[PDB]
Amino acid sequence: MDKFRVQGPTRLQGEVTISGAKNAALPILFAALLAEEPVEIQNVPKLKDIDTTMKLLTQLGTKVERXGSVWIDASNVNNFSAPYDLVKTMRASIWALGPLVARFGQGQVSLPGGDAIGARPVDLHIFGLEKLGAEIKLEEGYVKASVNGRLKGAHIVMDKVSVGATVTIMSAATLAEGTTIIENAAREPEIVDTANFLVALGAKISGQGTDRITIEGVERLGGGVYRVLPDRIETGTFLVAAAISGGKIVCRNAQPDTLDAVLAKLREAGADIETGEDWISLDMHGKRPKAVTVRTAPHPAFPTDMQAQFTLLNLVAEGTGVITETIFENRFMHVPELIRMGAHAEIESNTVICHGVEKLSGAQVMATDLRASASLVLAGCIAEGTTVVDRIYHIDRGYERIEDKLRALGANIERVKGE
Numbered sequence: 001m002d003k004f005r006v007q008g009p010t011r012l013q014g015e016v017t018i019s020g021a022k023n024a025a026l027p028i029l030f031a032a033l034l035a036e037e038p039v040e041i042q043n044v045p046k047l048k049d050i051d052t053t054m055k056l057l058t059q060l061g062t063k064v065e066r067x068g069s070v071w072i073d074a075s076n077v078n079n080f081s082a083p084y085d086l087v088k089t090m091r092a093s094i095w096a097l098g099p100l101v102a103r104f105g106q107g108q109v110s111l112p113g114g115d116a117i118g119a120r121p122v123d124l125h126i127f128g129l130e131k132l133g134a135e136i137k138l139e140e141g142y143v144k145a146s147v148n149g150r151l152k153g154a155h156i157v158m159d160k161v162s163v164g165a166t167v168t169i170m171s172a173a174t175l176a177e178g179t180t181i182i183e184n185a186a187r188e189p190e191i192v193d194t195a196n197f198l199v200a201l202g203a204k205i206s207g208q209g210t211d212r213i214t215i216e217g218v219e220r221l222g223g224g225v226y227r228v229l230p231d232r233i234e235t236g237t238f239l240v241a242a243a244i245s246g247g248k249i250v251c252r253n254a255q256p257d258t259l260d261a262v263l264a265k266l267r268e269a270g271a272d273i274e275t276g277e278d279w280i281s282l283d284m285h286g287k288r289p290k291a292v293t294v295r296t297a298p299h300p301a302f303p304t305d306m307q308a309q310f311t312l313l314n315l316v317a318e319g320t321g322v323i324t325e326t327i328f329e330n331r332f333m334h335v336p337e338l339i340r341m342g343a344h345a346e347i348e349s350n351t352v353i354c355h356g357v358e359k360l361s362g363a364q365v366m367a368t369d370l371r372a373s374a375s376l377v378l379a380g381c382i383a384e385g386t387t388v389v390d391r392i393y394h395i396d397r398g399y400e401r402i403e404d405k406l407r408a409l410g411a412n413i414e415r416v417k418g419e
């Protein structure tokens, strides 16, 4: 069981190159099932889910190869079924459904039983395809969708906002006959990226990033080269890494416009920030951060995925600051871990009240949340002594070699074993 062993305190400073966003890469990879011509997806991070997706795609008859890029040739998809064995570890598997039925007239995806770990409904996906003219067949453990000819554009009102279902509906609609309108569409930067990818293949889509996406169906999608957007949360993580350690950092391969809220929040903390078209710099000038007040909310407001990071910031900032989760519940489980590191805070309902301390102290800590976990590693960097963060496979799943990046920033960190 891998652990990160960190020796602090160390000032995090220098440069880091942001990896492609896993959350844009995934939907884009599935959308490539629509491309009749070879496609080159650049800036794809080396992550578990990417591998699982490549395997799933190969199983379908897709010709797949990888490095920085993932090369895809789906001009010849022959197997319209995603089996239990390959979808078992990945919810995103449902994304194969729509492209299959839209392009080939049929798709089937295996669904983990009710009791399986991480098992969640995909109702929105299925009923969305239905609105598009897909004939649906359901039996415990699988969903099949089919159509005679092209799907039919429809006016679709979403009762629940869903990143997942928005991708499925927007994707399949690029091949349908007519216009499809998605009201209450997810607004995420990853949704905009997915749409941009589709458009790059010849799709007709507008409104991406707003509450209303409009797709005009076309004959077919071609091939080409597309560069996956930078990972906004990863970028936020490294900004905070410099912000809490008096450091200065320049993030390469970034997209400032996907971080308005995070950047303004950092400025409130006394950070000196600069941005370019593809870079972001953060300079603390050796100073301790100032405590901030944070309210998480839907994009493009302050992101809940930056919460644990900002909590940490408050915990070592000058002064008191409150962090409120306005939508999500139970997002503070990891706070007791930080308090074991010498932090001072109180959790009250949907908020964490932070009292900044001078220096944290090393400890053996653990968190199951990717973000919280990463925050633990950051704390280990600036804390006094030795910190051992357990179960870092959680981090490995969403961050591309975070220890390598941290090391280049000046961290005393290492991957160690323990069973």
Ligand SMILES: O=c1ccn([C@@H]2O[C@H](COP(=O)(O)OP(=O)(O)O)[C@@H](O)[C@H]2O)c(=O)[nH]1
Residues within 6 Å of the ligand: 120, 121, 122, 123, 124, 125, 160, 161, 162, 163, 164, 165, 186
């Ligand atoms: O088929 C679906 C897809 C989503 N949701 C709900 O909408 C929320 C947001 O979904 P989204 O796809 O944005 O996130 P994900 O499920 O990918 O974590 C979920 O937590 C569910 O509560 C649902 O009920 N059925």
